[PDB]
Design a binder for this molecule. Structure first.
Ligand code: FE
Length: 315
């Protein structure tokens, strides 16, 4: 009757990490963590709601959905970014382009775009929300995806309906059924996939977060080959994100059942994993690190930890 916290992995790579997370947790004598493999965030959201798993980290994009019936999941902990000396539970949504180009934010029409994924914050909600006016979209019933698949010549918005909006998956590098998948099986998936999409030359603009270029480039010189599109219709060097970003957004978060959620145990698991497996904590396992050729598995790579979401009873 050992009922540990059961984590929901989306895709094989994530599964694998969870399992590694598990043996190391056992190794160091911390609370145990078990692993359930799902295929999509939604598949996870469901499992959790039906007691087949207890937790999963979601992008600020899905948090709202997950909280509605019949799901009713509620965030228990938020990811923490920044550095130890300065930590934050927010990040910046920016648009990165190659330096050398003329176009400004208001001149994206007809260009090729790279997004982290459908419904995520920096990769979709913010940019699209901002480009709204230029989209000439005649509200619902017509899907915003429709309006966007006609504003950019081609894109890669992992998770998008390939059959309806084939334009939105045109640039995606996934093989077969994984092309445009909202999973690590799709190489242009997530911040780094989106940025890779720009670096590989598939798109002209990448909607990602402020640290990507910093996290991704082995040579600091190479950062110079890129720049940011600011909202005043100017371009600034990559480190100017504090003065050139589309929005400041809250961090990704761990969600759980509003009822019988095991919040206390989840929290305990996290607090311990972070102490043992956080940044530069162990040569054996990094909770916030992903293998070569995968990224942001389970948690945001290079995040620094978690912050407990205040107490709730009314929910
Ligand atoms: Fe995000």
């Amino acid at each position: 009757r050992r009922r540990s916290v059961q984590w929901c992995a989306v895709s094989q790579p994530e599964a694998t990490k969870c399992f590694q997370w598990q043996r190391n947790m056992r190794r160091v004598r911390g609370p145990p963590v078990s692993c359930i493999k799902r295929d999509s965030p939604i598949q996870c959201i469901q499992a959790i709601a039906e007691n087949r798993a207890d937790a999963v980290t979601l992008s600020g994009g899905f948090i709202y959905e997950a909280g509605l019936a019949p799901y009713k999941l509620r965030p228990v902990a938020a990811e923490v970014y920044g550095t130890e000396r300065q930590p934050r539970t927010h990040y910046y949504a920016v648009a990165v382009v190659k330096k050398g180009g003329s176009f400004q934010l208001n001149e994206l029409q007809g260009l090729k775009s790279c997004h982290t994924g459908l419904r995520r914050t920096a990769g979709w909600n913010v940019p699209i929300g901002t480009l709204r006016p230029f989209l000439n979209w005649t509200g619902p019933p017509e899907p915003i995806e429709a309006a966007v698949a006609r504003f950019f010549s081609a894109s890669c918005v992992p998770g998008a309906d390939k059959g309806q909006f084939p334009n939105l998956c045109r640039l995606c590098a996934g093989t077969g059924e994984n092309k445009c998948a909202f999973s690590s099986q799709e190489p242009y998936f997530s911040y780094s996939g989106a940025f890779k999409c720009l670096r590989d030359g598939a798109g002209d603009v990448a909607f990602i977060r402020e640290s990507t270029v910093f996290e991704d480039l082995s040579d600091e010189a190479e950062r110079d080959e890129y720049e940011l599109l600011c909202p005043d219709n100017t371009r600034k060097p990559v480190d100017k994100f504090k003065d050139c970003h589309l929005a400041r957004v809250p961090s990704h978060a761990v969600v759980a059942r509003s009822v019988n959620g095991k919040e206390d145990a989840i929290w305990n698991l996290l607090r311990q994993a972070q102490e043992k497996f956080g940044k530069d904590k162990s040569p054996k396992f990094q909770l916030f690190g992903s293998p070569s050729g995968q990224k942001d598995l389970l948690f945001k790579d290079s995040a620094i930890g978690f912050s407990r979401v205040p107490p709730r009873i009314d929910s």
